Amino acid sequence: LSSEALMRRAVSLVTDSTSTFLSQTTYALIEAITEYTKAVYTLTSLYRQY
Amino acid sequence: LSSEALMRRAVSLVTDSTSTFLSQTTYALIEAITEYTKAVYTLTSLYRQYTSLLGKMNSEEEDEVWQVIIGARAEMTSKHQEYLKLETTWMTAVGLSEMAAEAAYQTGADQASITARNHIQLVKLQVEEVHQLSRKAETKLAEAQIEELR
Amino acid sequence: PVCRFMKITVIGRYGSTNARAKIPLGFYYGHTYILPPEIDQHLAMMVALQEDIQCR
């Protein structure tokens, strides 16, 4: 709408794009931490089996 | 424990907010379809006056309508400066909706996957339907041109 | 005019809807002599200040 509202909408577009990127990065981080933990657990389980 | 209750009240607040938002967007969609139809009709009416009514009136009104064409073209460009951002915000909305569909398919939430797929489909239908009214008017203009030429 | 308190008023534009903007304060010129310690002792410190600033 107004100049401040136009700035709000522009930063809304920019932050929606960067939030798409941020959601991708955060989901990748969560999956990476899950793989972290599951690889450690699998190694410990193999050691326990041995 | 289970975070089911946490999700429950979080999405209860979310659903109240989005029900208010759905009523507000019904009103805003009435407003937006009205404004979009008005803008398209203004464009086509100024085109019709540019093409159909040259030379019938006297010289003073000729100069008057020429200055009207110039000033109205400038003002229409100024007003249409808002529509360029609509395309980009629909681009980012479509991208975010496709991402949401993919992420919900990946996580496996059937309700969220259906919500995101219907979200992309519904925003596509809404934007394509306002653009479809616009392009129906444009097609009518082109048909009137080809019938007027021949 | 012998002024001591100063006030500024602004008038907006009918075609302007902006909320925040910057307006310059400007410049104000005025001496401190009023007559229809203004007696010749007013020169006593002005001359000393002028001499000091001349040395600087």
| Domains of chain B as residue ranges with CATH | 1-150 (1.20.58.70)
Between CA C56 and CA C52 the distance in angstroms is 6
**Experimental method for this entry?**
cryo-EM
Contact B116, B97 (CB under 8 A): yes
Which value in Å is the resolution of this experimental model? 3.0
The tokens describing B36, both together, are: 């979009």
Chain B residues in contact with A19 by the CB 8 A cut-off are 96
Would an 8 Å CB–CB cutoff place A4 in contact with chain C?
yes
Q: Looking at the partner chain, which of A13, A23, A24 has a beta carbon nearest the beta carbon of B88?
A: A13
> Which chains, if any, share at least 3 CB pairs under 8 A with chain C?
A
Between CA B126 and CA B33 the distance in angstroms is 10
> Chains C vs B: touching, with 3+ CB pairs under 8 Å?
no
Task: Give CA separation, A9 vs A6, A20, B79, B85, in Å.
Answer: 5, 16, 16, 9
Between CA C54 and CA C47 the distance in angstroms is 10
> Chains C vs A: touching, with 3+ CB pairs under 8 Å?
yes
Contact B103, A28 (CB under 8 A): no
- Pick the residue from chain B with its C-alpha nearest to A31: B107
Between CA B140 and CA B47 the distance in angstroms is 13
Chain A residues in contact with C17 by the CB 8 A cut-off are 2
CB contact under 8 A, B85 and A23: no
Contact B94, B123 (CB under 8 A): yes
The tokens describing B91, both together, are: 């681009």
Distance from CA of A32 to the nearest CA of B (A): 15
Looking at residue B9, its amino acid is: R
Chain A residues in contact with B88 by the CB 8 A cut-off are 13
Contact C2, C34 (CB under 8 A): yes
The tokens describing A35, both together, are: 């793989």
Nearest to B35 by CA among A1, A44, C34, C30: A1
Task: Give CA separation, C41 vs B68, C23, C52, in Å.
Answer: 73, 41, 18
